[PDB]
Amino acid sequence: ADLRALAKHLYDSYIKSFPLTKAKARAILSPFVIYDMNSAIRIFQGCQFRSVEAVQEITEYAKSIPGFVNLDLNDQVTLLKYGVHEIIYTMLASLMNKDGVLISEGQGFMTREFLKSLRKPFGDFMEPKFEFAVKFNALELDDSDLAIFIAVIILSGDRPGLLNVKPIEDIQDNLLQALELQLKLNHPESSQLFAKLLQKMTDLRQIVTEHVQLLHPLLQEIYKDLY
């Protein structure tokens, strides 16, 4: 059918857009372990720099989603604006376990306790994403499921200020069918995977809103607006 072609195309584009896949993360999870100060504001700013990296990679991945480049430009702008943060957290889950997260494209690993011990502002920076990551990682998704999931996420017709919702929901419809079939084929004995996955978007958005809540002139200019 159409849905396996769509799923293979999306998987191939995910492999090509994202250097460090979930499979490689699971493989690792040897990295340099950062467990304390001997191994503040530098960690937070580094996370924002990695985030701008990732925004660029995600936008490139979005352009490969069939139909997306054809949409009205304002609607592509606002879909990426509100989608990239939820996708960043979805992809960050791939790099985490209960004890820490892999950083630096897989060569480092920083511990959850070292992150939890930072001074007042930065001590809760990461803790909601660890709490979420444990739940999301319990779904035991792999890369081919995530490739379709994040596309679904990008094609969300509820973002405020959308000009033309109809083609976007049409595409998300195709994607949703493709995802449902992908999860039936890959996870036979995972009874209601589709529904549980869609439920996870509620925690995704709650993370995003809480993180928005918590939040050199040329550098200031590069790393403003898209977080």
Ligand X SMILES: O=C(O)[C@H](Cc1ccccc1)Oc1ccc(-c2cccc3ccccc23)cc1
Q: Is 26 annotated as a binding residue?
A: no
Q: Which of 144, 142, 170 is nearest to 156 (CA)?
A: 170
Strand partners, 32: 108
Cβ 25 to a second copy shortest distance, Å = 22
Q: Is 68 annotated as a binding residue?
A: no
Cβ 123 to a second copy shortest distance, Å = 17
Cβ 218 to ligand X shortest distance, Å = 9
Cα separation, 92 vs 101, in Å, equals 8
Q: Is 107 annotated as a binding residue?
A: no
Per CB under 6 A, 48 contacts ligand X: yes
Cα separation, 170 vs 168, in Å, equals 5
Give the one entry of a second copy, ligand X, none that residue 3 binds, where binding means its C-beta sits below a cut-off of 5 to 8 angstroms depending on kind. Answer: none
Per CB under 6 A, 112 contacts ligand X: no
Give the one entry of ligand X, a second copy, none that residue 191 binds, where binding means its C-beta sits below a cut-off of 5 to 8 angstroms depending on kind. Answer: a second copy
Give the position of tokens 């504001």: 41
Handedness of CA 22, 23, 27, 31 (dihedral sign): negative
Cβ–Cβ < 8 Å for 179, 148 = yes
**What is the side-by-side order of every strand in the sheet holding 32-34?**
32-34, 108-111, 100-103
Q: Which of 194, 211, 223, 226 binds a second copy (CB under 8 A)?
A: 194
Q: Give residue 182's identity as a one-letter amino acid code.
A: Q
Q: Candidates 17-25, 39-47, 75-83, 156-164: pick the segment binding ligand X (CB under 6 A).
A: 39-47
Task: Give the interface with a second copy as residue ranges (CB under 8 A).
Answer: 135, 156, 158, 173, 176-177, 180, 191-192, 194-196, 198-206, 209-210, 227
Provide the annotated binding site for rosiglitazone: 48-51, 85, 211, 223
